[PDB]
Design a binder for this molecule. Structure first.
Ligand SMILES: *C/C=C(C)/C=C/C=C(C)/C=C/C1=C(C)CCCC1(C)C
Length: 227
């Protein structure tokens, strides 16, 4: 086929792979029980993204959804990636501040709704309703971010400065990157169709890679992961 966005898919596949092996290698040398935990979670994140990026590079995870009088290309493999990578990222953050089980369950549950309605909206055939689903998905995301900013940050204050300061950064990178996803979707292929697919794929790989390998590098190179 040779679609305009393949080069960005090939670049995302590459970055996720390198980041995966590096974390995997760095993670299996570590003996600390707790550090091992964070390593297993942070390595798995780019591993899942890598395979999904690879699948898309190879022509899977794409479907034509009709609406707006057009046959629109929707990369659904993206939601198969995020369904597992986003809750894992939330988990990494919850383990850092010693979040309570109740908080985690609700964060992952909220996360499940976000991706679910997100995909339903990306698949919806009535244009206007695509935004209803989008809206719900976004509201779910703001809830998650609110918890991370008001809840978590508060509990990270019962931690050492080193741990509280590693969280602030990861929390900040997450609030900026996650917010961005909602806007890309809205003005992109799933939404208004203002931004072309090739550029949209570029925006998504930059957010995906920053949010996984970027996040992982910051987290795994810190000593706050030690028990
Ligand atoms: C590695 C992937 C990460 C960190 C992905 C984060 C993805 C989001 C925060 C996605 C959010 C979305 C919305 C707020 C609404 C519309 C649909 C989504 C799923 C693109």
């Amino acid at each position: 086929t040779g679609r305009p966005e393949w080069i960005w898919l090939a670049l995302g596949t590459a970055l996720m792979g390198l980041g995966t092996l590096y974390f995997l290698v760095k993670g299996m040398g570590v003996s600390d029980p707790d550090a091992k935990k964070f390593y297993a979670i942070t390595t798995l994140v780019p591993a899942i993204a890598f395979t999904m990026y690879l699948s898309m590079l190879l022509g899977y995870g794409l479907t034509m959804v009709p609406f707006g009088g057009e046959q629109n290309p929707i990369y659904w493999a993206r939601y198969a990636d995020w369904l597992f990578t986003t809750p894992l990222l939330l988990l990494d953050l919850a383990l850092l501040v010693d979040a309570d089980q109740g908080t985690i369950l609700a964060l992952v549950g909220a996360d499940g709704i976000m991706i679910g309605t997100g995909l339903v909206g990306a698949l919806t055939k009535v244009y206007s309703y695509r935004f209803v689903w989008w809206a719900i998905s976004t509201a779910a995301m703001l809830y998650i971010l609110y918890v991370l900013f008001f809840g978590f940050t508060s509990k990270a204050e019962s931690m050492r400065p080193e741990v509280a300061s590693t969280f602030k950064v990861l929390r900040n990178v997450t609030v900026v990157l996650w917010s961005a996803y909602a806007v890309v979707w809205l003005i992109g292929s799933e939404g208004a169709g203002i931004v072309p697919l090739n550029i949209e794929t570029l925006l998504f790989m930059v957010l995906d890679v920053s949010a996984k390998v970027g996040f992982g590098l910051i987290l795994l190179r810190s000593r706050a992961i030690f028990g």
